[PDB]
Write a protein that binds this ligand. Structure first.
Ligand SMILES: CC(C)(COP(=O)(O)OP(=O)(O)OC[C@H]1O[C@@H](n2cnc3c(N)ncnc32)[C@H](O)[C@@H]1OP(=O)(O)O)[C@@H](O)C(=O)NCCC(=O)NCCS
Ligand SMILES: CCCCCCCCCCCCCC(=O)O
Ligand code: NI
Ligand code: NI
Length: 89
């Protein structure tokens, strides 16, 4: 059942008022699990470490290499639930 739960969680995040701002480490965690859930293992070329943020995103994603889709969705959903328990209401 994780796939549909995950889709809804993503929608909830996507819909957040453009006002709410989350800290970067949290955003990165959401990001890496989002990528690992949807695309799977990192599949792009390593960006230059000179492009700081793009590189940080790359390494975050790379760091969850080999986590299957279901565990990645669960981790994404657990992080969101931690901050927004009512997200699926
Ligand atoms: O500017 P910005 O806000 O950093 O947006 P960017 O396009 O740079 O990157 C945002 C990323 O969030 C991803 N994203 C989209 N919706 C998301 C969500 N609900 N949760 C996590 N990541 C999400 C996109 O895939 C995009 O990743 P990519 O650039 O690796 O393809
Ligand atoms: C610092 C950059 C962090 C990654 C930015 C893209 C993912 C944003 C995740 C949705 C917002 C939380
Ligand atoms: Ni199921
Ligand atoms: Ni430069």
């Amino acid at each position: 059942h994780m796939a549909q739960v995950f889709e809804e969680c993503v929608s909830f995040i996507n819909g957040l008022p453009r006002t709410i701002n989350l800290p970067n480490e949290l955003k990165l965690d959401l990001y890496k699990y989002y990528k690992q859930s949807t695309i799977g293992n990192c599949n792009i070329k390593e960006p230059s470490a000179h492009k700081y943020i793009d590189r940080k995103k790359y390494e975050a994603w790379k760091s969850v290499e080999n986590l299957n889709r279901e565990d990645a969705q669960k981790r994404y959903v657990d992080i969101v639930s931690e901050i927004f328990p009512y997200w699926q209401d």
